[PDB]
Design a protein around this ligand. Structure first.
Ligand code: HEC
Length: 111
């Protein structure tokens, strides 16, 4: 129900997930620029809506969520429910395991 109770994460599995469901709109490497969505480099611990050069929705700026395992796990279940008014078009990742694997990868990849 929460990150706390979620399955352990496997970054290899998480990579598959990222590639198929997020890569279209997000970069992760420093210097890579933006896509439909902002570059996620250095995501962990940062305030939402603050990456330079990307035009965020007012909601994504106003929420000012500090991204971490906790917040990401809730967010990913249903982004539009988490930040009503966001322009990210993504239904959500329903399974606890899928979220845990994706987060494990992001931790490594966005570093
Ligand atoms: C294009 C169709 C998207 C897909 C697929 C995914 N994301 Fe996304 N993301 C997209 C946009 C246009 C935005 C900005 C939203 C806004 O209201 O401004 C985002 C934003 C994020 C964020 C917030 C980052 C921040 O700096 O605050 C995160 C953490 C994020 N996106 C992650 C993410 C992941 C892990 C996805 C696969 C599950 C994914 N997004 C899909 C566009 C698109």
């Amino acid at each position: 129900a929460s990150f706390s109770e979620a399955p352990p994460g496997n970054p290899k599995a998480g990579e598959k997930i990222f590639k198929t469901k997020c890569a279209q709109c997000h970069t992760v490497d420093k210097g890579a620029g933006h896509k439909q969505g902002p570059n996620l480099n250095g995501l962990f611990g940062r305030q939402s809506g603050t990456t330079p050069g990307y035009s965020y929705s007012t909601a994504d700026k106003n929420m000012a969520v500090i991204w971490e395992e906790n917040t990401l796990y809730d967010y990913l279940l249903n982004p539009k429910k988490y930040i009503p008014g966001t322009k990210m078009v993504f239904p959500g990742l329903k399974k606890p395991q899928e979220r845990a694997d994706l987060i494990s990868y992001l931790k490594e990849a966005t570093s």
